[PDB]
């Protein structure tokens, strides 16, 4: 598991990738095709919240659901 202490041990310029590395497989389970885009969207969130989402499945799911609805709305807006 990724912890606050582990994340702080990393070079600051690496911290988002450490999060993305752990977030992606879970998001890909939920959304196999679009996981890469969704992970990119969530990585904009603050690291503390991302750490919480990594260890709370309900929290991750609800943010992923939001990301998907925003992506779909944007698809209609670009159309």
């Amino acid at each position: 598991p990724l912890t606050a202490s582990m994340l702080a041990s990393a070079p600051p310029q690496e911290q988002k990738q450490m999060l993305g590395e752990r977030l992606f497989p879970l998001i890909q389970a939920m959304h196999p095709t679009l996981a890469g885009k969704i992970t990119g969207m969530l990585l904009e969130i603050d690291n503390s919240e991302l750490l919480h989402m990594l260890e709370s499945p309900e929290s991750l799911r609800s943010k992923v659901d939001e990301a998907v609805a925003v992506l779909q709305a944007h698809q209609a807006k670009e159309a």
């Binding site: 993305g20 890469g36 990119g40 969530l42 990585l43 904009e44 925003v70």
Partner: peptide, 11 residues
């Protein structure tokens, strides 16, 4: 949430 975000590529 920003739908223009850069796509993640996993290692």
């Amino acid at each position: 949430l920003n739908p223009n975000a850069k796509v993640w590529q996993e290692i």
